[PDB]
Design a protein around this ligand. Structure first.
Ligand SMILES: Cc1ccc(OCCN(C)C)cc1C(=O)N[C@H](C)c1cc(-c2cnn(C)c2)cc(-c2cnn(C3CC3)c2)c1
Ligand SMILES: [Cl-]
Ligand SMILES: [Cl-]
Ligand SMILES: [Cl-]
Ligand SMILES: [Zn+2]
Ligand SMILES: [Zn+2]
Ligand SMILES: [Zn+2]
Ligand SMILES: [Zn+2]
Ligand SMILES: [Zn+2]
Ligand SMILES: [Zn+2]
Length: 307
């Protein structure tokens, strides 16, 4: 049979039916199923298996593909995959979504959002599954998202927190945000965020209000406005509150209805008209009013007019 850690480079192996897979190769998986406590059967022979890194060759290959050295990672990825490959991934409005199952509402919103923002993942495993998710087979991608976020199937997820962990494994080095804070006593302070901090802001949903200026506390209340922003997109987050989404003013948004952590997530996207994707369900409207917590805007470069 074949054992591998990345499903790219296959290592050939010969097995004995008297000793279980766990005796010969350590923890072994087969399509998410755990064959560690299962003896070798005749149905599968010469097939590819997932094994934990036990030698340095596998340890290196495991980093080249996943960019992590945590031994628990492979197990968590394999256990999430066993759920995600049973999920259904319908095509809603040309985007790949997830039919509701196991509190995946936050996963569906993130998946729909990722198909609409420009993002390059550093781990080859993330990028390869990202591509195959856009094609309609997002099982391995959703499993990887869970493993990289230290979350399990069924656990409650925050879309803003999920996007953050994904952005830290994405190439956002070219992104830059220049801010200026104006306290009357203190004066003017210029800070320059880069990477994940250049893309996300918590406090307001309106990108315009961020450009105008947000009232922030200072070491002395001051005002923080956006000076220059170079990034393929920006994420504006805020606690869930009623908001009016206008057609053409944003890319996509996260609607959150319910109590803290217990609530359910919906995805609103701005196409030729406002669409609302709740798993496999699609509703159309010209205007939208509802409780929004994240809004994704498209950007390329920007420099403020006030100096
Ligand atoms: C689903 C889910 C899953 C997991 C989860 O984990 C949170 C804990 N993490 C550290 C692991 C949160 C959520 C969740 O409800 N998110 C929505 C978006 C949420 C809702 C509410 C809220 C308040 N009252 N009502 C009825 C609703 C408040 C905030 C919030 C306000 N301020 N902020 C941040 C600090 C600045 C976040 C966020
Ligand atoms: Cl890394
Ligand atoms: Cl990374
Ligand atoms: Cl609603
Ligand atoms: Zn090899
Ligand atoms: Zn990396
Ligand atoms: Zn399940
Ligand atoms: Zn399941
Ligand atoms: Zn001050
Ligand atoms: Zn839900």
């Amino acid at each position: 049979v074949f054992t591998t850690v990345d499903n790219i480079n296959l290592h050939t192996q010969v097995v004995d039916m008297s000793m279980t897979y766990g005796q010969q190769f350590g923890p072994t998986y087969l399509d998410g199923a755990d064959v560690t406590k299962i003896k070798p059967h005749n149905s599968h022979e010469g097939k590819t298996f997932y094994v934990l890194p036990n030698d340095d060759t596998l340890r290196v290959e495991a980093f080249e593909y996943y960019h992590t050295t945590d031994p628990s990672f492979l197990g968590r990825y394999m256990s999430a995959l066993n759920h995600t490959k049973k999920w259904k991934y319908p095509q809603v409005n040309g985007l790949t979504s997830i039919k509701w199952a196991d509190n995946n509402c936050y996963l569906a919103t993130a998946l729909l959002t990722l198909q609409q923002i420009e993002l390059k993942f550093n781990p080859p495993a993330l990028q390869d599954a990202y591509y195959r998710a856009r094609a309609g087979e997002a099982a391995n991608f959703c499993a990887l998202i869970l493993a990289y976020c230290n979350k399990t199937v069924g656990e409650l997820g925050d879309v803003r927190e999920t996007m953050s962990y994904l952005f830290q494994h994405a190439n956002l080095d070219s992104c830059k945000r220049v801010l200026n804070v104006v306290c009357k006593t203190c004066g003017q302070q210029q800070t320059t965020l880069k990477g994940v901090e250049a893309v996300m802001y918590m406090g307001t949903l309106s990108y315009e209000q961020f450009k105008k200026g947000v009232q922030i506390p200072c070491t002395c209340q001051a005002t923080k406005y956006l000076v220059q922003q170079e990034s393929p997109f920006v994420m504006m987050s805020a606690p869930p509150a009623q908001y009016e989404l206008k057609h053409g003013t944003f890319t996509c948004a996260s609607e959150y209805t319910g109590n803290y952590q217990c609530g359910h997530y919906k995805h609103i996207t701005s196409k030729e008209t406002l669409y609302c994707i709740d798993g496999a369900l699609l509703t159309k409207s010209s205007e939208y009013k509802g409780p929004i917590t994240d809004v994704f805007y498209k950007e390329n470069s920007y420099t403020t007019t006030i100096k």
